[PDB]
Scaffold this active site. Structure first.
Site, mmCIF file in Angstrom:
data_model
loop_
_atom_site.group_PDB
_atom_site.id
_atom_site.type_symbol
_atom_site.label_atom_id
_atom_site.label_comp_id
_atom_site.label_asym_id
_atom_site.label_seq_id
_atom_site.Cartn_x
_atom_site.Cartn_y
_atom_site.Cartn_z
ATOM 1 N N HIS A 59 -24.569 14.141 -11.138
ATOM 2 C CA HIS A 59 -23.595 13.949 -10.036
ATOM 3 C C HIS A 59 -24.263 13.900 -8.630
ATOM 4 O O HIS A 59 -24.012 12.978 -7.870
ATOM 5 C CB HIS A 59 -22.511 15.079 -10.013
ATOM 6 C CG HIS A 59 -21.384 14.832 -9.035
ATOM 7 N ND1 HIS A 59 -20.193 14.228 -9.394
ATOM 8 C CD2 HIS A 59 -21.260 15.113 -7.699
ATOM 9 C CE1 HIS A 59 -19.392 14.126 -8.342
ATOM 10 N NE2 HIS A 59 -20.011 14.646 -7.301
ATOM 11 N N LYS A 102 -26.098 6.429 -4.322
ATOM 12 C CA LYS A 102 -25.092 5.497 -3.735
ATOM 13 C C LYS A 102 -25.261 5.401 -2.177
ATOM 14 O O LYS A 102 -25.228 4.313 -1.562
ATOM 15 C CB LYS A 102 -23.673 5.943 -4.087
ATOM 16 C CG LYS A 102 -23.240 5.730 -5.568
ATOM 17 C CD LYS A 102 -21.706 5.663 -5.588
ATOM 18 C CE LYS A 102 -20.992 6.965 -5.290
ATOM 19 N NZ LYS A 102 -19.524 6.638 -5.018
#
Ligand SMILES: Nc1ncnc2c1ncn2[C@@H]1O[C@H](COP(=O)(O)OP(=O)(O)O)[C@@H](O)[C@H]1O
Ligand SMILES: Nc1ncnc2c1ncn2[C@@H]1O[C@H](COP(=O)(O)OP(=O)(O)O)[C@@H](O)[C@H]1O
Ligand SMILES: [Mg+2]
Ligand SMILES: [Mg+2]
Lengths: 359, 355
Positions: A226, A233
């Site tokens: 995560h 990103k």
């Protein structure tokens, strides 16, 4: 406020280490006796904080739903308080109950976020320091209850057995580099759908602790994935958008270092960076330089940083961003390398939390 | 607790920006009127703070010296309140007084540090007192940085650069110079030193030299200290090696910020310990060596913060460390960061997550 919430909120949460969680998995009865008490305590602690929020936030349908879910889950669990841990049907029913609670809480994070958005669009969010404080606590509390229930379900249920190589959700031999490469690829697939190009990965590893060996630690690979996915990103968006004038993209450079006490991962981009002024703003829930999306989103909800940081801090790690404005940014995750030092970091509802709410 | 000290401590310090200092530096009467008020105010503010410290600390001969020096200087300066700005002699005499003050304050930092060492070696210091001593010393040293800055500017202007301010500070040349100072020290002590690998990026004006308005001696201090640190970490961690990894530095100018990052491969520091590094005193070196005094990090970070920049360290334990200086790129945003003795400071001298 139900009497059960008032009661159980009087206790502090009891933090566990990853070492101890790895031992759930080495007595069902002991894990049942612990969790039947600890889950109510942690639900009750956070429900007292939910009650303190601004009236106009607490009355959103989204917050009222989360509150009603938390209260039901607490009741579900308190119903086990009369049962004997020697009762094999009770233990079975308890696993089924945690599966129901887990499924019930599945959309808590989005639902809470949604409520936070309605509030914003109707009233205030990023400049409300009490809301930032609350959300770090609420989301850390959710991380910790999902961690504990899942550990019990994945070790003791008949039907949900998790990765055969993990103990519950914990990998005792977590292949850190492989997680980095996987999260990088996940990020890359999305970046390609937004830009039709994405940066390459240039990775270096240094096993200071056991030189020339594969780097492993005891870790929860879903949490680590995560953090990395979110930081990648962000690095990929920064890089592509800043280099849209150039014939090629600078790679994202990652170094993974295992030292005596720490595992450190640094993610460096040439994405143009950020003014030091706004660095703290960046870790605010909902803060983003991208438009808020309506609904496969690359950026815009403004959760990647603060949530990734919670995951790093949860087991006494940390996550920091150091930027060179006009050039690029270094994101750094620090994880404890010793399972005995990886101890849950938990919010407690007490006088000092209440009070929270020369140069 | 003399009267004048109580009186001047009632005012709050008036922070200046680097741009103000340029603008009022490129009328001697104005500077005189300003400084004969502002210096006593800053000295009285820090004096009142000295009085809040632990008794066994305040009574060291070291802190008693500093207190008498500061009081005597406040008095020398308060004596000009009866003279005229239009008075050329008083103007000459004031410059001479600032020189005396500067001379008198020359050994403040080692005398204060000596006071602290004595106390910590002699006395039990609970967590809270230790925290208060860090907060006090950051404020006390910042206050001196600021008075030395103001007085130097009046001395240099009234008795290319505007005093100690370079309006086109060649950032990279200061880097190189601070590197060579450190290097010479390193060579002399360890018999070898790392090379410098230097990169620069002008994001604000591509392909042009990087200059901002800055005080080069302050920039030099911070870089020299950070380079001493990186060189010692490199040499000591690589003591069984044929050669040394270089110290890599990148200088970057963006819109609001000038950033300088100094990267070494000297083995890093556990995260646990990173904050402790900034404690006055804290050193892994024993008591000329590059290290031992344990002032490089906290003092460099004061210089950085003085005009609203910052100094941070982040390390990959087992590998190496990055130190990063941030400076404001615009002279109007470079405003003094000053301690004030007010009820909020006072409260500062006087759990919601599980342990
Ligand atoms: N590597 C980076 N380089 C430049 N800016 C960044 C980087 N990482 C984060 N940011 C800034 O911080 C903001 C918040 O990030 P995040 O919390 O991940 O939310 P989101 O990605 O949805 O914007 C980003 O919108 C971007 O403005
Ligand atoms: N680049 C670095 N790498 C490893 N350790 C460092 C580095 N910089 C500072 N440190 C640690 O911080 C400590 C304090 O630094 P400083 O405050 O400069 O005092 P001193 O240099 O006299 O020890 C050093 O003794 C060292 O242990
Ligand atoms: Mg993001
Ligand atoms: Mg030093």
């Amino acid at each position: 406020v139900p009497r059960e919430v008032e009661h159980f909120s009087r206790y502090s949460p009891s933090p566990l280490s990853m070492k101890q969680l790895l031992d759930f998995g080495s007595c069902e009865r002991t894990s049942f006796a612990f969790l039947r008490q600890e889950l109510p305590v942690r639900l009750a602690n956070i429900l007292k904080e939910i009650d303190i929020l601004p009236t106009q936030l607490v009355n959103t349908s989204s917050v009222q739903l989360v509150k009603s879910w938390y209260i039901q889950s607490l009741m579900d669990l308190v119903e086990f308080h009369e049962k004997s841990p020697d009762d094999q049907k009770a233990l079975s029913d308890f696993v089924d109950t945690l599966i129901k609670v887990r499924n019930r809480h599945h959309n808590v994070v989005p639902t809470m976020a949604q409520g936070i958005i309605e509030y914003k669009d109707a009233c205030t969010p990023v400049t409300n320091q009490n809301l930032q404080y609350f959300l770090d606590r609420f989301y850390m509390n959710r991380i910790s209850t999902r961690m504990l229930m899942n550990q019990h379900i994945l070790i003791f249920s008949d039907s949900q057995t998790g990765n055969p190589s993990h103990i519950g959700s914990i990998d005792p031999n977590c292949d850190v580099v492989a997680v980095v490469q996987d999260a990088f690829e996940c990020s890359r697939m999305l970046c390609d759908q937004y830009y039709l190009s994405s940066p390459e990965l240039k990775l270096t590893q240094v096993n200071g602790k056991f030189p020339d060996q594969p780097i492993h630690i005891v870790y929860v690979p879903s949490h680590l994935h995560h953090m990395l996915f979110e930081l990648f990103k962000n690095a990929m968006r920064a890089t592509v958008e800043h280099q849209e004038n150039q014939p090629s993209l600078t790679p994202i450079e990652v170094i993974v270092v295992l030292g005596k006490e720490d595992l450190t991962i640094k993610i460096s981009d040439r994405g143009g960076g950020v003014p030091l002024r706004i660095i703290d703003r960046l870790f605010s829930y909902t803060y983003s330089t991208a438009p808020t999306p309506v609904m496969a989103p690359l950026a815009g909800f403004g959760y990647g940083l603060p949530i990734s940081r919670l995951y790093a801090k949860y087991f006494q790690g940390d996550l920091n961003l150091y930027s060179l404005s006009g050039y690029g940014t270094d994101a750094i995750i620090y994880l404890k390398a010793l399972s005995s030092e990886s101890i849950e970091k938990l919010p407690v509802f007490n006088k000092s939390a209440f009070k929270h709410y020369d140069w």
